[PDB]
Design a protein around this nucleic acid. Structure first.
Lengths: 133, 124
RNA sequence: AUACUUACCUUAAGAUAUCAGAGGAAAGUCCUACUGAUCAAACAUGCGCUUCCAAUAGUAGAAGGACGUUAAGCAUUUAUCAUUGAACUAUAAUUGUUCAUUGAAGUCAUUGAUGCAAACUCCUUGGUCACACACACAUACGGCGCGGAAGGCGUGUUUGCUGACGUUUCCAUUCCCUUGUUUCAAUCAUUGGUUAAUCCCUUGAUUCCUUUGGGGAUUUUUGGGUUAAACUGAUUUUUGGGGCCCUUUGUUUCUUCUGCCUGGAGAAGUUUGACACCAAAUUCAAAUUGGUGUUAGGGGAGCUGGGGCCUUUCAAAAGAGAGCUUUGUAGAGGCAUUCUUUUUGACUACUUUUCUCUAGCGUGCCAUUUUAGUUUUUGACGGCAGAUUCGAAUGAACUUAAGUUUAUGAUGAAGGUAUGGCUGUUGAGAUUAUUUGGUCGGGAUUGUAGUUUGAAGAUGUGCUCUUUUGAGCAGUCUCAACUUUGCUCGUUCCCGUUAUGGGAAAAAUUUUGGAAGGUCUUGGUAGGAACGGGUGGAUCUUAUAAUUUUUGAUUUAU
RNA sequence: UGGUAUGUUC
């Protein structure tokens, strides 16, 4: 439910479906999704994207935050175990090493998993309307 | 690769084709010319075929099939139209459509100059 | 080069978008710088369109190759046929086995071929762009930096396949900088904007002299002018500094000539021309004739094609209009009419039986008024608890101060506040009881009664048609158009009056079309139009479904 | 009214 935060990713893949699959290949090569193109990816709204804990990726195109992305996992522990896989050796997507750390704010889908473990949505949408001001 | 919906075989000069023949063999090369009988001329076309030993891996049942393909290299061949069965497009041309336009205007200029010269030379 | 000699040739036709409508030379033909609709091509031009565009914060990676190595990798599998003799096993003409002899062919390979898999090395390709080292997101993710590649779709203009060639007694007709780049500073020059010295015009305030008025000075006031001492921005000359680039490898690759690494430079030139290179033979070179190429990249001024947005002006739509009534006109549709018999088809009422919510009144069903209860709404609001905060203005407390807590707390915003919510008021939905209404019979079967249709008769006016109960037109009904009339409403103005009517028109508003101007952008800048033919090439039709390409002998078959 | 080709002469 804790989402990891990634800086220093490549910002030229463009399409989100293509970006997620290419990233996910560099995460776990010979994954189920990465080696069969033209499979639909699961959309899991408030189906694991990948086994060994990976539940969604979430990127944006917003010009403030290009290279950063957020992977959210099943539980709090897999978030810490993923850092363990690196074992102080930096993962690299394309030619750039990805610094990574747990986020300052948990993911929204992670909050949905923990809360099920809609008023929250009311609060978030009112936050969005306040930020539209 | 995306190909224009109204692109006939006259548009696809210098694209890289994928010609299929009756005996199960694929010819891959830059398209140079064609004819009424549909017999092509291919610049760097490389023949490929599936051997009879590799072939039973194609039959319907790992995830991905791996077919070792016997390829021969031949160069500037003319095919015969009777054997051709269907053609598919593999790769775009080297030059861009704008850059192809620039080259064509240049070549028209140079050719007109040369025939103007040949005329005025035969007069004197 | 000429000329001469021979030798070989001197041809498939036809066409140039389609459909419809108007015109010209009853059927068709031809044509229309005619007109609609469709199609196709080119060129501009757009879409919040779709996909793709490589570490330097680093020694990478992506796509495609190798006709590359390890490599005799590891695992399987292949290397003739006939004749004759000899031994040989044997159920056996001697089928099996071995040795030699004659003849016949015979891709090389066995370090091969085939199956499997892995490591390594190397080639080509690319925006290795700009701003960033960022806490995002459920309607899942500002797709809201500039370009480039490729498609999808839309609009506009031109064309009706397209190109050379000739004629015109057609139109056309430009310049400038630059060739490492970028940046900072010193300095020179130019130009604008304000202030300050001589001030002037115009004019707000003051002050002084004089006659209501005028004038002087200050603010050099408001803006302009004289002038340029100060500041600020844009362009330029010279010198220095920093960064990046030079594989630009024939050291900028537009050409020649001069030339270069303590440097990026100098001269001349730019299309009926010049330059580079190739080939020959005269018996080195030069000479000529014949060929293949090159003549570029960036920026600017004019001139011009296109889009978006804004202004003005003009025309048509929307409202002197709309509806309703009255009279006339004319167009279009539909058919007349009445009764009786018969009871063909249909409907309604009553009788018997059967079944159905309860056979019936009520209950039950339906409509819904919010009168009442209940329920619900990311409904809305206000307040509270976490500190309700914030325009941090001010007081006080903890505190050096800062920061925090609280008060002035409605004087104004922030839904309230929370990433658990509570409480109150009000709007909507649903249900019931009601304010109240409507409903309690239907379906099957059965005969009778009534109306209307199938049929007959008497009728009902005249004509056309006709065997007729008869169909169309004068006849009658319904609907729209024109003309007159008062009533009702209405966008704008005026009047009678602000009950309402009368009159006028968009002159106020919008959308559509056009002209002009402004702004921003995007493209072009040396050919273009018209005419023409024993002109080239594309597309189309017909010869042509008869052995050489497209009107079937490659689904391995019985 | 032509084309290509050939070889000779100058």
């Amino acid at each position: 439910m804790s989402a990891l935060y990634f800086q220093n990713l490549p910002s030229r893949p463009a399409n989100k479906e293509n970006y997620t699959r290419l990233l996910l290949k560099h995460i776990n090569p010979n994954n189920k999704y990465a080696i069969n193109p033209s499979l639909p990816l699961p959309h899991n709204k408030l189906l694991l994207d990948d086994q060994m804990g990976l539940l969604e990726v979430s990127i944006s195109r917003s010009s403030k935050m290009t290279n950063q992305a957020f992977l959210t996992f099943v539980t709090q522990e897999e978030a810490d175990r993923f850092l363990e896989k690196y074992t102080t050796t930096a993962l690299k997507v394309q030619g750039r090493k990805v610094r990574m750390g747990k986020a300052r704010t948990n993911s929204l889908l992670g909050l949905s998993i923990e809360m099920q473990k809609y008023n929250l949505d009311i609060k978030k949408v009112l936050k969005a309307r306040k930020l539209k001001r | 690769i995306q190909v224009a919906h109204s692109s006939r075989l006259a548009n696809l000069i210098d694209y890289k084709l994928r010609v299929l023949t009756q005996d199960g063999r694929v010819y891959i090369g830059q398209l140079m010319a064609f004819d009424k009988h549909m017999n092509l001329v291919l610049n760097e076309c490389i023949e490929e075929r599936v051997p009879k030993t590799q072939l039973d891996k194609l039959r319907p049942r790992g995830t991905t099939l791996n077919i070792k393909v016997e390829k021969r290299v031949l160069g500037l061949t003319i095919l015969r139209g009777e054997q051709i069965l269907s053609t598919v497009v593999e790769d775009k041309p080297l030059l861009s459509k704008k850059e192809r336009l620039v080259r064509d205007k240049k070549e028209k200029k140079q050719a007109q100059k040369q025939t103007k010269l040949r005329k005025e030379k035969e007069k004197k």
